[PDB]
Symmetry: C3
Subunit: 299 residues, 3 copies
């Protein structure tokens, strides 16, 4: 399952490039690249990535923005592509392959608010997603969410699985080896991590006693659903897919399909460490536990 | 796992019979029959079916209709039965077995609008469903859906799994061999297909640029949930189980339990081919991708 | 996988102790104990339990109640703990371990109405949950549910899985051996059962023709989601997690994440026996079918 032209390849991460070019237009440039990521202690996965992160870098745009997206494929041998779930596009024209050492540019609107998956769309898509080519784009609602004024703090969390390396039989027929959370930064000083079994246990997300926390979440799969729960609290408000209309209240646990997103909000009332899990506990045991450390200052 | 009395049996498909007998009463006659279906290229499954289709033929009635249902069991040796999720009925009186070469008639009301599973209810129900005895009945709401006037086109899609042939161990403990979509005709000229890995890729559903499409969907299982997504669009409106009250907006992906239904609506803004998937990509890779071809005319 | 200090241990069930100590304060005392439970005919599981039941005893409190909870750990060698999904608490202070032959007391508010999972929170949590340390706490809404006046009868049902005994490899990587329902009593004379493949088939829940039934349900997992369906009816009303705001209508089947709850309501229109399933039929075949017997009197 090792591709000869990937042997010894470890392309250093490259920052996302984004810039606004109009009141409703934004440029985004990513790479597709092959990068070693430590997904569990002592376990390197030579991931297929956007920008050397898996999941990829966070993208945030405003509702109504047109994205002018460029992919620079640095993979020496495999084509790659980009599918944003946020956008209205022709898949056979706008989510098409970019060949090795080439670039492609595609343009399409994000008119729907929410927390969307993005991923490589190159056949076999399972292979590209499972090897690491997944991520989130957030589209901020033009009128906000009704509970905005209540939120004290926010983070992004993404859930994904890892399988046996580049093994299509395992991808289709096996249980995941690892299931993991990562967090992607929304503001300076936020963590920005990859999908691994340990970082958000050792370096918890931080908050202060009494705060209302918002998490933008997506379960990118490839294969499993997620039963998303924060220990020691109840979600005050949940917006399915991050659309303000899809409001629930007082949920213990939010069911996310594969590619499913949500905005969830909850209050942390006491100092301590609060695990964040998928409540499918086989997955939690295989890595899918993050921690939120709540202190009298926030740090 | 081969039943001696089924060896060499391939009963030709029989059309559904339906006729209205009152303003709120409809007759439906199906068969239970044993029919070879090509579920993947070169792979025949000697399915247990209603009417020689798997999933079975589409049934459409109006909210408030009483169904007077007859099953004619053409299986030479196995009893079969019918459970409509649409109806209020006594399962132990109204969903009972019909013996080989016999008929049975049952009557019961459909008072709830939506997109319901039907299936054989004979013990072991897993065996009967897994072998192909599943389908959809749509109950049209008396006052429609709020977004009716926006819809330009509509189709029905059903998701199911196929396992090792008639293998109860695999049915209970194995991963699916194939996961598939089929489409069932609502109007003359619509496709009517069986659950296979290829037909709706080779013969895509058709639409025209700019249209709002409605899909009536159900995941009949037997065993898996579905993460239903149309590539290149976002669902404008979703009605869970097809009940007009259970409205969501702006969903990327709709989580369907086993037997779960929905009405989903989305706009196709550009010409091209739009895949339709379950986003549990192991299932997509095992067959569960249909295509929608969007042209400047619709065809 | 057998713990030497558990060999031959079968601690007799102990009743839940609860008493109200103020208008908004309640005392609850449970045990953690090791008890043999027949989970399928001829199959004993030496379960890790609260109070000698698996799932554990039902707890019911009012919205706004503070719970003063004591756990008495009767396990000779393993620590145990309690996590109520109903409560706001510091997990690292309030859901901490109680050592063998010790007690611990923790206090925390239940301010959210609904149908919540509880479970042991001792690492590895998968092991403690899978071995039987799960249950439900219901928090009654201060203003009720809008459909209260329509309900004629109510029961509690819980779904769980059982795996190979105390086998962490199976817990993380295997399919469940059994998937089961149990019912926990809300009023005198209601059944109170453990998660097994047979009791609620042999001793069905009882109701009368024409009644509206409410079920408080939770799928405690540990690992699977549930596609909850009552044969022969449609849910008139569903409140996700039991929060009155999360209202759906006319659902055939309710998708429950692991730890997910609901209040569901449906009408039984005809005499007979009505199966209650998860519609993931591999799980149903492995035990997850209960029965509701509907008679002209109710019994
Ligand atoms: Cu403007
Ligand atoms: Cu530009
Ligand atoms: Cu790729
Ligand atoms: Cu996708
Ligand atoms: Cu899994
Ligand atoms: Cu605050
Ligand atoms: Cu009339
Ligand atoms: Cu008639
Ligand atoms: Cu049958
Ligand atoms: Cu059913
Ligand atoms: Cu599967
Ligand atoms: Cu139109
Ligand atoms: Cu008071
Ligand atoms: Cu007290
Ligand atoms: Cu424990
Ligand atoms: Cu929990
Ligand atoms: Cu299972
Ligand atoms: Cu009544
Ligand atoms: Na908007
Ligand atoms: Na109606
Ligand atoms: Na309240």
């Amino acid at each position: 399952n090792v591709i000869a032209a990937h042997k010894g390849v470890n392309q250093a991460p490259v920052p996302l490039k984004m810039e606004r070019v109009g009141p409703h237009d934004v440029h985004i440039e990513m790479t597709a690249q092959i990068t070693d990521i430590e997904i569990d202690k002592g376990k390197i996965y030579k991931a297929w990535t956007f920008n050397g992160q898996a999941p990829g870098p966070l993208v945030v745009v405003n509702e109504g923005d047109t994205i002018h997206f460029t992919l620079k494929n640095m993979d020496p041998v495999v084509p790659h592509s980009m599918d944003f779930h946020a956008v209205h596009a022709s898949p056979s024209k706008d989510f098409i392959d970019v060949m090795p050492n080439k670039s492609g540019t595609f343009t399409y609107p994000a008119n729907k608010p929410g927390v969307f998956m993005y991923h490589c769309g190159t056949k076999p898509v399972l292979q590209h997603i499972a090897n690491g080519m997944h991520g989130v784009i957030i589209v901020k609602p033009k009128n906000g969410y009704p509970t905005d004024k209540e939120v004290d703090r926010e983070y992004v969390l993404i859930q994904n699985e890892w399988y046996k390396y580049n093994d299509m039989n395992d991808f289709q027929n096996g249980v995941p080896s690892y299931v993991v959370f990562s967090s992607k930064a929304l503001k300076p000083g936020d963590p920005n991590t990859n999908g691994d079994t340990f970082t958000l246990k050792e370096k918890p997300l931080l908050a202060k006693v009494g705060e209302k926390i918002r998490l933008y979440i997506n379960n990118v799969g490839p294969n499993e659903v997620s039963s998303f729960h924060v220990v020691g609290t109840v979600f005050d408000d949940v917006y399915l897919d991050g659309n303000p209309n899809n409001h629930l209240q007082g949920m213990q646990t939010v069911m996310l399909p594969a590619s499913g997103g949500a905005v969830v909000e909850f209050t942390v009332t006491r100092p301590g460490t609060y695990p964040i899990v998928t409540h499918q506990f086989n997955h939690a045991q295989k890595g899918a536990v993050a921690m939120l450390k709540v202190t009298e200052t926030g740090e």
